[PDB]
Each structure stands twice: as C-alpha cells, then as structure tokens.
Amino acid sequence: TLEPSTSITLAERQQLAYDLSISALLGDKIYNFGELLHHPIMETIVNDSNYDWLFQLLNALTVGDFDKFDSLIKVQISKIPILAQHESFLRQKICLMTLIETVFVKNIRMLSFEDISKATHLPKDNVEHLVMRAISLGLLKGSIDQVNELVTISWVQPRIISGDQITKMKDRLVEWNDQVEKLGKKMEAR
C-alpha cells in the first residue's frame, strides 16, 4: 500500500508489470498470477502484446490446456522446458488444497491415483513424480502410499479464495450445538 508516494504514469506501469509478470512464470511460490490481478495493474495496462499471459494462464491451471498459451507466445520462453514443468505444479496445487477443508463436504482427506490423474491430465507414472518434486521444493509436505493408492499431503501453501468455507464451518457450529441442548443441558440439570 502506497497512496501518497511512488508517482508513476502509464508508461512505467507497463514496465513494472513486466518484471511482476515474468517473476510468476517460473515462480512456484505464493499463489499465482492472480495476485497481480488483485492489485490495480491489469486494469491500468493494455490487454494484448504479451500482457494477456495473466488471463490465459489463469484458466490454464484449471482446464489444463497448454496449446492455448504456447500458441500466442514467442519462442523465447517456450525453449526452456522448465517453464512447462512449473505450470504442472500450480495446476495440481489447486486441487491439493481441497483435501482437508475448502469445498468438499465430508472434509475427509483421501486421494487415489486415478482421481488425481484425471485432474492433472497426466498418467499415473508422471503424477507420482510430480508430487515428489512439489514437496522437494518446500511447497508441500506429507507422504505417499502406493500400496493402497493413498496420498497424504500436509497443508502448507495458503490461498486467498473464500466463500466456500462459510457453509462447511457451519457444520462444526450445528453439530456441536446439538450437544449443548442434549449433553450440555444433561450435566447442568443434574
């Protein structure tokens, strides 16, 4: 937050957004390009001339289509295979944060090899190596069970999303309130 200071025009905002964007191409840490959208940047800059990578890679981490981004870019960033590797981590990290409590109802943490293969658009052999490299970089924790096909990943990387935790937090509110009327009033009326 700087309201009073750092006087900047539309010319330097595009130059500043360049270093901010490229930092998130290979950056696997602290959310993704959407943080640059959270700040008044994309609205203050042009939507084309390779400034649209925030919009293309936003849905690319969900649908998992690499042909949309690679077709609109040049050969500069597509020559390095590492860029295509980091895009696979952020795609899976969205679903891996849903294992405990975000969206899913029963709040039970379980992951098989078949369910994660369809979400990451990768086979069973490449998904086992992708999780191991994700934990090795410090983004995640936990262990992996290949015998029973179980994936236990400890929650590390936070997220800025909200609105899906209000309903599931009520589950702890309603289920525990029933013991106040039954068990809670049983000991009090003793």
């Binding site: 709040n107 589950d171 702890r172 289920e175 525990w176 013991q179």
Partner: protein, 284 residues
C-alpha cells in the same frame, strides 16, 4: 458507634507496594476520602512519600513535595480530605515503630478522629491479613458513642490479645482496631471470575490437554505405587490386634489409614475421569 475502617480494593494493594523496598526500611503515605462517624468510613485514594534520612518522624513528611502533589489531586478527581497518615514498619512486639513517637500527637491536633495504618506482616505474611494501627487518646475522647462494643472488645482474659505484648495500654488506651472491607458491584464482579488459580481461562480444553496427557503415562505408573502401600497398611493393622480394646494408644487408629486409602483413591480416580471427558471431545 465507632469508626470501622473499610479497606477498598486498591487501598490494600498499594500498602504492600509502597513498603516493597527492603524488610528493615520504612515508608509512609496519606489516606484520603470523606466519611462520617456512626458507620461511614472510607479511603478513596492512597499515595506514598519518599524515604528521608530521618526515618519516620515529624520531619519525615515533606510539605513541599506534599503541596506540589496536592495540586495534582484536583485535576484528576483524586482530591479528597486527608483522613490520616498510613505508614509501613518492620514491626515489634509493642510500639512497632521505635522512631515514631511525636507524629500522631501532632496529627491529632488537626483532626482528633484521624488514624494511622501500618502493615504488620512485612515478610510474616500469613493469609489472615493481620494489619495494625495506632490512635492516641490521652485526655478526652470520652463522653461519646460506644467504642468497644463494636467488634470483640471488652477483653483481657489472662493477658492474651493480638500480639500479647499489649494487654491494656497497647500503644495508648487500646484503640481496638476494626478491619473490614466493602466494594461496589463492579469490583466484586471482577475478582470472583478473574482470580481462581492461574489464567488458562476462556477455553479450558486444549490448554492443559497436551500437558496433562504427556505426563499421563508417568502418572499411570505413579498411582500404582500409591495403591501398593494401601493394603499393606490395612494388612498389618488387623494382624497385630487380637484384643479389640485399647492398650495401643490407638484412640483413632483406623480412620487415619482408612482415609489415606480412600481420599487418595478418591483423588486419583476423579482426575482420570473428569479430565478424561474433555481429554478428547473431538467429535468431528
């Protein structure tokens, strides 16, 4: 009736804080407030004075420091009438302050109803909170209401009263201090809920959960030894008595060892149950 001093919440705590420096050393202070005889006695604010080289005497109080401080009482709402001068002394059997003689006699000239308070224990603290005072009488103070009839006066069975260095005279005339306390509805609401043992409060679940559960493995082994020595006492108790009479100076033999096998058993089982109910309480 007489004047029964009612110590407020802050009046008791500041007296221990002012005499906090040193066992042998001594300080003083000024009691404030306004009150009328026949009930009302109250001390609003208390404040200390710097320790001088003369100890406690007529020259101990500084009128310059008192006048400069008194002007600050008015703007803060702290200004009240001075009802006396409270001190702090290590204490003796009789005349707890050997350097304090001519003070109270100069204090009774301004107000004859003014008293002086001194904190007795000063490292002797017990928890009955025994506090001492003195007030001069000399000629006069009679032909008035009933001083002794208030609280447990008209005494002198044998010599025993209070410190029992006093008998009749005490310091002078047996002023017969009466120490009570009264608080408002807001002050009583605090210490009841606030003060219990320590502060875990507002959630008791997880604070002591991990600490008690970690030592539960060692507690399980220690409570077993207590039961081992339980029946061994009762076994030797009934083995040596074929009489059921008293040559044994055993006037109550059983109830002591029976309570040691009961109250200890009653202590060890309740802490493994009542705490076990909140030891999980996980649900979902």
């Amino acid at each position: 009736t007489k004047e029964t001093v009612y110590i407020s919440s802050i009046a008791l705590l500041k007296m221990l804080k002012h005499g906090r420096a040193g066992v042998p050393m001594e300080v003083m202070g000024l009691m404030l407030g306004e009150f009328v005889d026949d009930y009302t006695v109250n001390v609003v604010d208390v404040f200390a004075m710097p320790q001088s080289g003369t100890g406690v005497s007529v020259e101990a109080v500084d009128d310059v420091f008192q006048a400069k401080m008194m002007d600050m009482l008015k703007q803060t709402g702290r200004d009240q009438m001075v009802v006396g001068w409270y001190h702090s002394h290590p204490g003796f059997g009789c005349w707890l302050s050997s350097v304090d003689v001519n003070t109270q006699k100069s204090f009774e000239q301004l107000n004859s109803r003014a008293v002086a308070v001194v904190v007795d224990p000063i490292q002797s603290v017990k928890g009955k909170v025994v506090i001492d005072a003195f007030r001069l009488i000399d000629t006069g103070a009679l032909i008035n209401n009933l001083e002794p009839r208030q609280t447990t006066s008209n005494t002198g069975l044998l010599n025993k009263a209070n410190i029992q260095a006093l008998i009749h005279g005490l310091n002078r005339h047996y002023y017969s201090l009466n120490i009570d306390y009264h608080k408002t509805a807001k002050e009583t609401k605090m210490l009841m809920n606030l003060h219990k043992e320590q502060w875990q409060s507002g959630l008791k679940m997880y604070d002591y959960e991990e600490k008690e559960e970690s030592n539960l493995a060692a507690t399980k082994s220690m409570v077993k030894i207590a039961e081992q020595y339980s029946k061994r006492i009762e076994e030797e108790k009934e083995l040596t008595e074929e009489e059921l009479k008293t040559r044994y100076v055993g006037r109550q033999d059983p109830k002591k060892h029976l309570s040691e096998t009961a109250d200890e058993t009653l202590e060890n089982n309740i802490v493994s149950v009542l705490t076990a109910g909140v030891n999980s309480v996980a649900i979902k």
